[PDB]
Amino acid sequence: MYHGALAQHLDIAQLVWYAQWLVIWTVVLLYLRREDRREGYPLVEPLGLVKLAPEDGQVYELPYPKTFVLPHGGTVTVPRRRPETRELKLAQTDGFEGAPLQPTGNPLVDAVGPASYAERAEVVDATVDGKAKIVPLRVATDFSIAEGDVDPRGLPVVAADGVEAGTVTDLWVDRSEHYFRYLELSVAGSARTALIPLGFCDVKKDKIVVTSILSEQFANVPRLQSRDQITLREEDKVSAYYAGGLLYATPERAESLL
Amino acid sequence: CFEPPPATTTQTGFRGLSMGEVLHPATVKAKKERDAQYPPALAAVKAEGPPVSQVYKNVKVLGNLTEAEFLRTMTAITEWVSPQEGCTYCHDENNLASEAKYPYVVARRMLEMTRAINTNWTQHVAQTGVTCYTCHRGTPLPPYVRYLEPTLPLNNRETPTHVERVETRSGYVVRLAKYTAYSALNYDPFTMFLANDKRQVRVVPQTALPLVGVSRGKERRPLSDAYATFALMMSISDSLGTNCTFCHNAQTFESWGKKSTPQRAIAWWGIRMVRDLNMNYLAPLNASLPASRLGRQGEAPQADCRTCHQGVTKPLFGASRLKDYPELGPIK
Amino acid sequence: ALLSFERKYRVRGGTLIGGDLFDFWVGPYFVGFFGVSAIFFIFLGVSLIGYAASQGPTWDPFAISINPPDLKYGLGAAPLLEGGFWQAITVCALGAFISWMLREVEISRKLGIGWHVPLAFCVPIFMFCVLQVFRPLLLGSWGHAFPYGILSHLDWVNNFGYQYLNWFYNPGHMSSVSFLFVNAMALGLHGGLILSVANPGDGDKVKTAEHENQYFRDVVGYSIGALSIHRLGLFLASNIFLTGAFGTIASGPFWTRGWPEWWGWWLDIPFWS
Amino acid sequence: ADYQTIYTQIQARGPHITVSGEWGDNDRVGKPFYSYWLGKIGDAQIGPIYLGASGIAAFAFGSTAILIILFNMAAEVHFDPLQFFRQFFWLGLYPPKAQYGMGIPPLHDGGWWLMAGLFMTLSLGSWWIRVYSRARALGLGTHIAWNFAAAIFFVLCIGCIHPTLVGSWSEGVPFGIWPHIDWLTAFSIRYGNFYYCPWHGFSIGFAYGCGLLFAAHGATILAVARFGGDREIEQITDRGTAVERAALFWRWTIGFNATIESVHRWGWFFSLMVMVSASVGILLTGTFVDNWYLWCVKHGAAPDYPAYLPATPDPASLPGAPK
Ligand code: BCB
Ligand code: BCB
Ligand code: BCB
């Protein structure tokens, strides 16, 4: 006789094989794939002819809402209905449903395509003890540049067109993570500063090179409401502006590479 | 520590199974050259006269040979075993029937053993056969022999370092490792498997589910048996200068039929042949050998696969003298 | 059919080749020229597989196997049924993988994000080439490559390993395995940390960037930081194959013995022999 | 290129932060120090470290286990130092070689191995408490401890539980570099080829999948680092363009997508399942399956191939074959 033999050529291991698959598909479809839908759902459609009710399917695919209670007050519940009311300066290139849209105006200023930001909260991200998290070193006075690294303050910023666009006057540090996230520059011949995320900066000994946008386009980098603070949505606006340059800084950037 | 391409590869299984030999051409060449030193057959002589059973005084094994034939054998033997020492290695030069020197009596036993291999172990040696040279390679002490503990260097013509010396306890793990293709397997497959027929090499179950009655507690073989078998198989591989897929489809090591090559069955017979030689011919020689020949347990040196094969899948790349020296078997 | 935030991102542009011609979506999928070529190769490769499999003895999915040619065919074309199908499928596989990789670049460009994912995806494509192209070329025969069968490809890995007596002693494999193990541990640690911070339980408040750093500083004395754990994970994972590739390529073209013996370079230093 | 995703161009230094726990704050020992070269690819601060009872307990048990192993290894080269260092990889502390069933083996044949395994186990338990406690002390969920628990359970399966289930200490994993590796082959050989164990297959799939997922997730967060995608907690509570773009990269590529929270659940789950699948495979092996290849043949799954060289009958089964 055999250990594990159940009968017909049923044996224990054979049954556990089925159970194993079942457990995996259950967790994957009924749990994980519904956790995947806590943002962006329900899917939207141009000009829904009529919907007296959401499809049953739109109810079935969603998890029950969860509520985060935020560290500095308030709550957030997901999923939740978040239409984007904001007008998009885009036009259909064709009537076909999967056709690409295209900017009717200045995509960088209009914030469309790779220049889009998200509707983040207009709140200043905070440290664990309640202070503004991302602040200029003019303010974060006990923070410094590590010995060995370029101090960019004073250095020219050179834009994609090789033209100098301004002068770095400060660095903004993440006081929660001890990590620089933006440079601030005086924009040449304008009377404004602009932040630029450090990821768009090639930091050299004698200059900061920025290939995402041309010198002219620094004029229109999003402006902050305060000089020494920045909100989560502003961070999105500023970052997105340069990202948009990667596709839109010149006419030829959107066309085929090769 | 690397070997430059090209590699010589063969196929020993259905395409896409990655079965076959992987050989470094320079190593094969070096072995071919070593093995090419096999002396050629002495010229044939005409069988004239009485059997030396009449002619000579103390001929026990080869008595049916004529004088010319017999002296040809003695000349061949001297060349294979004791070329540097000459006839007197075994003979009193004033009495050729004298059994006074131990190599004489050992040699008589070796004529019997050799005729036994060629007559009774054709399953293994087929029509290639063995001569004294296959093991001895021109010295009285064969280069690759085994005691009841692992010894180093494998080739005893090489001089041991102090750590290699069997007395040096701290060198034990390396003496074992170099017998099992450098693995760390903590088992000596010679004394476990090849010195006698006490142990079963097969460890893998032949049923899908565990049979009630052999599958729990002390009913079970210890897992150590599976290590030991792997150790034997590392050793067999290194001894023949080959890899597992020369014999097995690793899909199922325990299966035969399509899952095993013809060489695996020849290897099975080799295990039985080696055990016979050891139990019945070589181990008893400790009664006849000087103490200087014996191991630390009073064991005579005995044989494993390497004793003949010396790193080649066929000893001496399949060279044969079987037709040249019928005296040595097969004996009808 | 669009995520609620998706429409603003769906602009023209970003292609490597083709421009406006294939710059559109089918459902959620971006197409592009490389979507067209991916589909072409998948369709071909999958047709060849079906045809080959139909010519064989089985329709059990565990048992079907499409195998390379015998060694004797060297690096030449084999008859369809005896290796030729395998050779064709390998070409469609490479074509599909590389198209998939280049399609990812076009998607990255359109979104204004880095090309890190298609780059990371080159590593598995490279390893496929090591097994199927480079090592067979070095050994002089397509017949050294692995078969296409769910279980049969395991039998090839098995025999390949045992051709070198004990593959576990292969130094490139030791490195490969170590990265596989660290990477799996690290992914559980990284995923667990982020979940533990966003989901403290009861009605406790979501925690902070500072808590993440504090947790690992407490438990092991070092926190690598939030951006850096992602760089590390990409590094650990990639080096599973980048280091493994050396151990694979070495076996045969640069080492013909068992792998345990290779360590003779150490064991047999005469100083301590 | 975004150079930040390669290394930190300008490092910041600032006052060192401490997040207070519900207990144990006074058990943080050490002064932070900063490595500039470390700071190029990670946070530059090393230390302080938390001490605590469970951590200290872990070190005590672990060290004992290690001393039993090292002493037994030293005995193996007969306390020759140079040979010890030479042969270290090859040296090991082994389970019983003889079959004692579940009998406590003699010290010389598995007794020390058993002792070292016990202390290792207490070591792993103490550390799990530390991993669990620190999360609770800092007001965090316990997801890490639950992932760690599955890994510990796997070690118990191969070290202790499987030997107990078949009734033999001889089946445990030796301590040693090459020796613990040789076990993998011996165990697979004994049980008819682990390639044919479905739970070995599941484990591998999840382990390869961890490789896939961390390469994909790591690369995805570096690709959107320009938008602050690394700040994953606030991207969870307030979706930003970083993870909108990340989600859309994947939706456009493979047709479906995760969120920035849920991709960490996928990662955590894949990681867990490497160890869960492995354990189940080990628990079935020997208990209920003796030869995994034959089990697959029994259930019709195994592939078969033509003979290339002649099919070779077992000589042992031949008429008149010796034993
Ligand atoms: C008996 C033999 C053994 C063996 C033999 C072996 C060999 C011979 C090799 C490895 C290799 C490797 N082994 Mg080892 N191994 C490993 C782990 C590993 C891996 C880390 C590593 C790389 C695997 C690989 O090449 O994937 C390859 C995966 C690829 C190429 C994936 C390509 C994906 C592709 C780009 C896209 C595919 C798309 C699909 C077609 C699309 C599907 C569409 C659907 C989903 C919509 C572990 C953890 C263990 C343990 C614990 O026992 C182990 C034991 C053993 N290995 C045995 C000792 N192993 C390799 C190595 O690196 O060695 C140094 C190697 O060559
Ligand atoms: C050098 C070592 C190798 C190796 C060793 C290996 C082992 C030892 C094992 C596997 C296993 C598996 N392997 Mg193999 N492997 C596979 C695919 C597979 C799957 C059948 C399975 C689970 C893989 C997994 O989850 O990964 C992670 C990926 C995930 C989670 C994403 C989903 C991928 C999807 C399941 C792939 C499905 C593939 C389709 C069956 C392929 C054909 C589809 C086409 C026709 C449309 C591919 C597609 C390739 C290619 C293209 O190179 C490959 C190469 C290799 N594998 C190397 C040759 N692989 C396991 C198995 O169970 O085999 C039966 C297993 O035990
Ligand atoms: C010839 C032998 C084979 C073999 C035999 C084998 C066995 C016998 C086992 C595996 C297992 C496994 N194998 Mg297989 N294998 C694998 C891959 C894998 C893994 C997925 C999985 C082990 C899980 C793991 O992460 O352990 C690494 C993770 C560990 C050990 C967890 C540690 C956690 C712990 C808390 C850490 C504690 C550390 C402390 C500091 C210690 C302190 C020290 C002390 C002294 C104080 C691949 C990818 C391949 C390929 C490519 O061929 C392969 C081939 C083969 N394996 C061969 C067929 N493999 C296992 C399995 O899944 O079986 C179902 C298994 O048991």
Ligand SMILES: C/C=C1/c2cc3[nH]c4c(c3C)C(=O)[C@H](C(=O)OC)c4c3nc(cc4[nH]c(cc(n2)[C@@H]1C)c(C(C)=O)c4C)[C@@H](C)[C@@H]3CCC(=O)OC/C=C(\C)CCC[C@@H](C)CCC[C@H](C)CCCC(C)C
């Ligand atoms: C699929 C998921 C997996 C997974 C998961 C997870 N893995 C985790 C966690 C999760 C989630 C944790 O939470 C926990 C952790 O905390 O992480 C930071 C942990 C860990 N995974 C480790 C090792 C690891 N994971 C492996 C595998 C997998 N992990 C798989 C892949 C492997 C493999 C692959 O072999 C290894 C080796 C440790 C680093 C750590 C435990 C430490 C311990 O338990 O220590 C216990 C304590 C000791 C042994 C004491 C040590 C004493 C030493 C220093 C010696 C001192 C001697 C002395 C100096 C002598 C004095 C002499 C005197 C005279 C002067």
Ligand SMILES: C/C=C1/c2cc3[nH]c4c(c3C)C(=O)[C@H](C(=O)OC)c4c3nc(cc4[nH]c(cc(n2)[C@@H]1C)c(C(C)=O)c4C)[C@@H](C)[C@@H]3CCC(=O)OC/C=C(\C)CCC[C@H](C)CCC[C@H](C)CCCC(C)C
């Ligand atoms: C070290 C880093 C690793 C790593 C990394 C990354 N991995 C990525 C990415 C990154 C970064 C992606 O961006 C890309 C992706 O989009 O993710 C969602 C991807 C992907 N990784 C897949 C499978 C996968 N990754 C593996 C391993 C690792 N990944 C390692 C660990 C393994 C194994 C076995 O380990 C598998 C099977 C697909 C799901 C997906 C490709 C889809 C494709 O290419 O579509 C195009 C092609 C098809 C849909 C079908 C093509 C069919 C051909 C023509 C005919 C069949 C031929 C075939 C050879 C038959 C084999 C039979 C078999 C039984 C022997």
Ligand SMILES: CC(C)=CCC/C(C)=C/CC/C(C)=C\CC/C(C)=C/CC/C(C)=C/CC/C(C)=C/CC/C(C)=C/CC/C(C)=C/CC/C(C)=C/CC1=C(C)C(=O)c2ccccc2C1=O
């Ligand atoms: C003969 C024949 C078959 C012919 C036809 C072939 C065919 C398929 C035709 C379709 C024709 C159509 C419809 C269209 C043309 C357009 C086109 C090119 C379509 C492609 C169709 C196609 C080939 C689909 C296959 C897709 C594919 C390769 C899927 C694999 C999915 C798998 C298994 C992934 C493994 C990894 C995994 C488990 C992921 C789950 C978790 C996820 C989703 C992680 C991704 C992800 C990560 C990693 C983040 O870090 C992240 C961070 C923040 C937010 C989001 C994310 C996020 O989503």
Ligand code: HEC
């Ligand atoms: C030991 C390895 C030997 C060497 C070298 C040589 N001989 Fe030998 N010889 C040996 C044995 C065991 C025997 C007995 C054979 C048997 O069938 O029992 C012999 C016998 C002879 C004899 C016969 C003497 C007699 O009994 O009357 C002769 C004539 C003889 N051997 C000659 C001889 C010569 C000339 C050798 C070198 C060329 C020589 N032997 C070497 C063992 C060994």
Ligand code: HEC
């Ligand atoms: C391997 C299978 C052998 C074959 C074939 C022959 N011999 Fe041998 N011989 C072998 C061993 C393992 C030993 C024991 C170790 C030792 O050297 O004693 C021997 C020994 C001898 C001796 C004695 C050597 C000595 O101690 O001085 C002699 C003289 C001898 N063998 C002779 C001999 C002859 C004549 C053979 C062919 C007929 C022959 N041997 C074959 C292994 C093997």
Ligand code: HEC
């Ligand atoms: C032919 C020259 C072989 C080589 C090379 C290897 N193996 Fe082998 N193996 C061979 C035989 C003749 C036998 C049976 C022995 C007997 O007395 O019946 C075996 C057996 C095994 C086994 C046991 C199978 C069982 O039924 O339990 C295993 C696990 C095994 N061999 C493994 C193995 C490996 C891993 C090898 C390379 C290191 C290897 N073998 C080589 C013959 C030959």
Ligand code: HEC
């Ligand atoms: C000398 C007395 C031997 C010993 C000891 C062992 N083998 Fe042998 N083997 C010997 C001969 C003369 C031959 C050639 C036979 C022939 O067919 O030509 C062989 C051959 C093999 C083979 C066949 C190789 C092939 O066909 O390519 C194998 C696989 C083999 N031998 C294995 C083997 C093993 C594993 C042994 C120790 C247990 C062993 N042999 C000992 C002579 C001798």
Ligand SMILES: CC(C)=CCC/C(C)=C/C=C/C(C)=C/C=C/C(C)=C/C=C\C=C(C)\C=C\C=C(/C)CC/C=C(\C)CCCC(C)C
């Ligand atoms: C029921 C009964 C009676 C008892 C049951 C008790 C029980 C729970 C038993 C469990 C046994 C277990 C868990 C066994 C586990 C074995 C396993 C998984 C072992 C695995 C691998 C071990 C390996 C690789 C470790 C090798 C050890 C070493 C190389 C020594 C390490 C030493 C150091 C590096 C020294 C560090 C300090 C130095 C630098 C100064």
Ligand SMILES: CCCCCCCCCCCC[N+](C)(C)[O-]
């Ligand atoms: C594995 C068995 C446990 C061994 C003892 C480990 C010490 C326990 C320490 C408990 C600490 C409690 N605390 C502070 C977290 O509440």
Ligand SMILES: CCCCCCCCCCCC[N+](C)(C)[O-]
């Ligand atoms: C061998 C381990 C297999 C793990 C399972 C793989 C999970 C892939 C999930 C994709 C499911 C997608 N979708 C949209 C259908 O839900």
Ligand SMILES: [Fe+2]
């Ligand atoms: Fe993350």
